[PDB]
Design a protein around this motif. Structure first.
Motif, PDB file in Angstrom:
ATOM      1  N   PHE A  84      43.333  76.613  42.190  1.00 47.34           N
ATOM      2  CA  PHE A  84      43.915  75.658  41.250  1.00 47.34           C
ATOM      3  C   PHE A  84      42.978  74.459  41.268  1.00 47.34           C
ATOM      4  CE2 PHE A  84      47.248  78.147  43.219  1.00 47.34           C
ATOM      5  CZ  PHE A  84      48.061  78.522  42.152  1.00 47.34           C
ATOM      6  N   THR A  85      42.733  73.869  40.105  1.00 48.11           N
ATOM      7  CA  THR A  85      41.821  72.740  40.036  1.00 48.11           C
ATOM      8  C   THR A  85      42.298  71.661  39.085  1.00 48.11           C
ATOM      9  OG1 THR A  85      40.497  73.571  38.167  1.00 48.11           O
ATOM     10  CG2 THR A  85      39.911  74.362  40.357  1.00 48.11           C
ATOM     11  N   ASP A  86      41.661  70.503  39.192  1.00 45.98           N
ATOM     12  CA  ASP A  86      41.924  69.380  38.314  1.00 45.98           C
ATOM     13  C   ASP A  86      40.889  68.315  38.622  1.00 45.98           C
ATOM     14  OD1 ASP A  86      44.801  67.239  37.420  1.00 45.98           O
ATOM     15  OD2 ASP A  86      42.978  67.831  36.364  1.00 45.98           O
ATOM     16  N   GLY A  87      40.537  67.550  37.602  1.00 47.33           N
ATOM     17  CA  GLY A  87      39.568  66.487  37.777  1.00 47.33           C
ATOM     18  C   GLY A  87      39.947  65.365  36.837  1.00 47.33           C
ATOM     19  N   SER A  88      39.548  64.139  37.158  1.00 48.66           N
ATOM     20  CA  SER A  88      39.849  63.003  36.293  1.00 48.66           C
ATOM     21  C   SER A  88      39.053  61.769  36.717  1.00 48.66           C
ATOM     22  CB  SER A  88      41.361  62.704  36.300  1.00 48.66           C
ATOM     23  OG  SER A  88      41.820  62.202  37.548  1.00 48.66           O
ATOM     24  N   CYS A  89      39.003  60.765  35.845  1.00 51.43           N
ATOM     25  CA  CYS A  89      38.301  59.519  36.122  1.00 51.43           C
ATOM     26  C   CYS A  89      39.227  58.354  35.819  1.00 51.43           C
ATOM     27  CB  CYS A  89      37.063  59.382  35.235  1.00 51.43           C
ATOM     28  SG  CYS A  89      35.704  60.425  35.760  1.00 51.43           S
TER      29      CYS A  89
ATOM     30  N   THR B 144      43.625  76.306  35.632  1.00 50.35           N
ATOM     31  CA  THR B 144      43.193  74.949  35.310  1.00 50.35           C
ATOM     32  C   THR B 144      43.655  74.476  33.939  1.00 50.35           C
ATOM     33  OG1 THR B 144      41.255  73.490  35.016  1.00 50.35           O
ATOM     34  CG2 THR B 144      40.987  75.800  34.433  1.00 50.35           C
ATOM     35  N   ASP B 145      43.868  73.172  33.817  1.00 44.65           N
ATOM     36  CA  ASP B 145      44.272  72.578  32.548  1.00 44.65           C
ATOM     37  C   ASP B 145      43.082  71.750  32.058  1.00 44.65           C
ATOM     38  OD1 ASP B 145      45.070  70.755  30.568  1.00 44.65           O
ATOM     39  OD2 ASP B 145      47.138  70.721  31.289  1.00 44.65           O
ATOM     40  N   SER B 146      42.257  72.323  31.189  1.00 38.14           N
ATOM     41  CA  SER B 146      41.098  71.604  30.659  1.00 38.14           C
ATOM     42  C   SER B 146      40.619  72.192  29.344  1.00 38.14           C
ATOM     43  CB  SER B 146      39.936  71.618  31.659  1.00 38.14           C
ATOM     44  OG  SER B 146      38.783  70.999  31.101  1.00 38.14           O
ATOM     45  N   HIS B 147      40.792  71.432  28.273  1.00 36.43           N
ATOM     46  CA  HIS B 147      40.372  71.881  26.958  1.00 36.43           C
ATOM     47  C   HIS B 147      38.852  72.088  26.959  1.00 36.43           C
ATOM     48  CE1 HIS B 147      39.427  71.227  22.568  1.00 36.43           C
ATOM     49  NE2 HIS B 147      40.417  72.096  22.483  1.00 36.43           N
ATOM     50  N   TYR B 148      38.139  71.180  27.615  1.00 36.56           N
ATOM     51  CA  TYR B 148      36.683  71.243  27.706  1.00 36.56           C
ATOM     52  C   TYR B 148      36.201  72.506  28.416  1.00 36.56           C
ATOM     53  CZ  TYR B 148      31.853  69.899  28.916  1.00 36.56           C
ATOM     54  OH  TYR B 148      30.496  69.835  29.084  1.00 36.56           O
ATOM     55  N   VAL B 149      36.728  72.751  29.610  1.00 36.62           N
ATOM     56  CA  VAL B 149      36.333  73.923  30.377  1.00 36.62           C
ATOM     57  C   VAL B 149      36.726  75.202  29.643  1.00 36.62           C
ATOM     58  CG1 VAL B 149      36.561  75.135  32.567  1.00 36.62           C
ATOM     59  CG2 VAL B 149      36.572  72.638  32.518  1.00 36.62           C
ATOM     60  N   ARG B 150      37.930  75.214  29.083  1.00 34.72           N
ATOM     61  CA  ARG B 150      38.411  76.380  28.349  1.00 34.72           C
ATOM     62  C   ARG B 150      37.506  76.682  27.155  1.00 34.72           C
ATOM     63  NH1 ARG B 150      40.842  77.433  23.957  1.00 34.72           N
ATOM     64  NH2 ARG B 150      42.398  79.083  23.624  1.00 34.72           N
TER      65      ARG B 150
ATOM     66  N   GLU C 188      43.360  81.338  33.974  1.00 31.93           N
ATOM     67  CA  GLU C 188      44.716  81.102  33.513  1.00 31.93           C
ATOM     68  C   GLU C 188      44.741  79.649  33.078  1.00 31.93           C
ATOM     69  OE1 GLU C 188      47.744  82.263  36.327  1.00 31.93           O
ATOM     70  OE2 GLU C 188      47.500  84.311  35.573  1.00 31.93           O
ATOM     71  N   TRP C 189      44.674  79.440  31.767  1.00 30.42           N
ATOM     72  CA  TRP C 189      44.664  78.101  31.205  1.00 30.42           C
ATOM     73  C   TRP C 189      46.063  77.505  31.187  1.00 30.42           C
ATOM     74  CZ3 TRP C 189      39.835  77.257  31.563  1.00 30.42           C
ATOM     75  CH2 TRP C 189      38.909  78.275  31.279  1.00 30.42           C
ATOM     76  N   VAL C 190      46.207  76.359  31.843  1.00 34.18           N
ATOM     77  CA  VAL C 190      47.482  75.664  31.928  1.00 34.18           C
ATOM     78  C   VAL C 190      47.626  74.616  30.829  1.00 34.18           C
ATOM     79  CG1 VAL C 190      48.906  74.133  33.337  1.00 34.18           C
ATOM     80  CG2 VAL C 190      47.624  75.987  34.420  1.00 34.18           C
TER      81      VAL C 190
ATOM     82  N   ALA D 202      53.295  70.369  34.208  1.00 36.07           N
ATOM     83  CA  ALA D 202      54.734  70.563  34.361  1.00 36.07           C
ATOM     84  C   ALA D 202      55.050  72.032  34.628  1.00 36.07           C
ATOM     85  CB  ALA D 202      55.458  70.087  33.105  1.00 36.07           C
ATOM     86  N   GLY D 203      55.646  72.305  35.785  1.00 35.03           N
ATOM     87  CA  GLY D 203      55.981  73.675  36.139  1.00 35.03           C
ATOM     88  C   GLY D 203      54.879  74.329  36.954  1.00 35.03           C
ATOM     89  N   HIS D 204      53.810  73.579  37.206  1.00 35.00           N
ATOM     90  CA  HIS D 204      52.687  74.080  37.988  1.00 35.00           C
ATOM     91  C   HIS D 204      52.432  73.121  39.140  1.00 35.00           C
ATOM     92  CE1 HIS D 204      52.352  75.468  33.854  1.00 35.00           C
ATOM     93  NE2 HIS D 204      51.737  76.539  34.321  1.00 35.00           N
TER      94      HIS D 204
END
Length: 151
Positions: free
Chosen positions: A8-13, A69-75, A119-121, A125-127
């Motif tokens: 599971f991943t996530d990134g932000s600034c 992961t939830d990322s429009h860019y990566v997806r 698996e694009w999130v 919410a719910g994850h």
């Protein structure tokens, strides 16, 4: 049966560009390994990629990986753009390298070492694991210790 791992991943600034961080959780046989680090100045998208890179590189052997992961860019990058970037030698219209080519190539290199299932999130919410990555990333971005040399 090959080893089965969940990532599971996530990134932000904080602002964009700005201080940033990545958060990733690697789960195998119930055990959960956490990864996180913050950079003085980077971008949201670079951190999203970094989170996946770091987690995947931690795998010492070839595994069947379920990446969440939830990322429009990566997806968009993985499912569409990347095929065209390769066809064009990783160069854009101005004849200069595609943005974040350094991380895209590093991620592709890591991906090719395993059997990946994305698996694009759509919203954490719910994850729970992904929410944990989000807090892990934000915490690192608020206490950076690294420099994003690629940026």
């Amino acid at each position: 049966m090959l080893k089965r791992v969940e990532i599971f991943t996530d990134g932000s600034c904080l602002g964009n560009p700005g201080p940033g961080g990545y958060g990733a959780i690697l789960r195998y046989r119930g055990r959960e390994k956490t990864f996180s680090a913050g950079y003085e100045r980077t971008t949201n998208n670079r951190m999203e990629l970094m989170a996946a890179i770091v987690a995947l590189e931690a795998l010492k052997e070839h595994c069947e990986v379920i990446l969440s992961t939830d990322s429009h860019y990566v997806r968009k990058g993985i499912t569409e753009w990347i095929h065209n970037w390769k066809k064009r030698g990783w160069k854009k219209a101005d004849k200069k390298p595609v943005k974040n080519v350094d991380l895209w190539k590093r991620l592709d290199a890591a991906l090719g070492r395993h059997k990946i299932k994305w698996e694009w999130v759509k919203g954490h919410a719910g994850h729970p694991e992904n929410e944990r990555c989000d807090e892990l990333a934000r915490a690192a971005a608020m206490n950076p210790t690294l420099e994003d040399t690629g940026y």
